[PDB]
Amino acid sequence: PQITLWKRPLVTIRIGGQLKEALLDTGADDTVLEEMNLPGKWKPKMIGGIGGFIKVRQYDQIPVEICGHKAIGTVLVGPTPVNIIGRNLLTQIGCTLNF
Amino acid sequence: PQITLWKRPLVTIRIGGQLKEALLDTGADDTVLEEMNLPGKWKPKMIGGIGGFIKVRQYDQIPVEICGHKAIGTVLVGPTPVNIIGRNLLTQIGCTLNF
Numbered sequence: 682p683q684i685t686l687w688k689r690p691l692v693t694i695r696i697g698g699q700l701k702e703a704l705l706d707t708g709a710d711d712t713v714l715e716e717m718n719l720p721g722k723w724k725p726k727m728i729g730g731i732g733g734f735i736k737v738r739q740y741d742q743i744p745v746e747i748c749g750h751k752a753i754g755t756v757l758v759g760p761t762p763v764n765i766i767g768r769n770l771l772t773q774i775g776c777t778l779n780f
Numbered sequence: 781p782q783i784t785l786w787k788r789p790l791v792t793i794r795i796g797g798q799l800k801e802a803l804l805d806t807g808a809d810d811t812v813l814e815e816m817n818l819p820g821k822w823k824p825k826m827i828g829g830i831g832g833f834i835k836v837r838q839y840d841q842i843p844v845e846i847c848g849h850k851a852i853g854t855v856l857v858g859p860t861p862v863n864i865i866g867r868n869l870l871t872q873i874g875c876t877l878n879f
């Protein structure tokens with residue numbers, strides 16, 4: 682799709698079998714989801730945002746379907762204010778910015 | 781033009797007659813720039829992201845050019861680690877997400 686920006690670019694995703702809403706976030710290097718259970722191994726990591734640093738759980742090589750487009754990559758889980766889809770997955774689905 | 785998301789979507793902007801590098805950020809409601817001493821009235825605000833909140837100064841109706849496209853609107857100024865062009869100005873320069 683082409684998505685304009687007069688509203689937040691919120692989309693439905695599928696992950697670990699479940700639906701969620703998430704924000705397409707070109708200013709995020711990484712995909713960060715609010716607290717949820719995912720299968721498999723994870724590693725403790727830290728990541729910084731505008732307000733400082735948080736602890737997250739890093740899950741690798743995770744399948745995520747975004748507006749019907751498939752990705753498989755790293756998902757961080759922790760106290761983000763909103764689920765965000767970062768560039769690690771936006772690149773997989775072929776996103777670009779256009780003006 | 782089209783901006784890839786393999787790397788951070790940094791572009792040149794002009795504001796308050798300084799040229800700066802800033803992120804084209806679909807995840808940001810409002811534009812936030814690194815600390816700078818702009819002229820004019822402002823109002824305090826808190827904005828929140830990963831890690832919590834920062835305090836910023838809200839300026840209104842500031843001219844900002846972004847890759848040669850003119851815009852004018854709200855600019856927040858405070859201790860962000862990166863200059864961020866948010867949706868308030870992205871719409872004004874014609875920016876969409878596409879996949």
Ligand SMILES: CC(C)CN(C[C@@H](O)[C@H](Cc1ccccc1)NC(=O)O[C@H]1CO[C@H]2OCC[C@H]21)S(=O)(=O)c1ccc(N)cc1
Nearest residue numbers: 708709710711729730731807808809810812827828829830
């Ligand atoms: C978390 C979003 C809902 C909101 N943020 C925009 C977001 O794009 C920031 C923008 C950003 C970018 C760099 C540093 C701080 C903030 N990215 C971010 O937090 O990404 C994190 C996940 O991937 C990592 O890569 C970048 C930081 C990590 S935000 O910076 O907090 C923000 C909040 C309010 C406004 N008006 C402006 C910006």
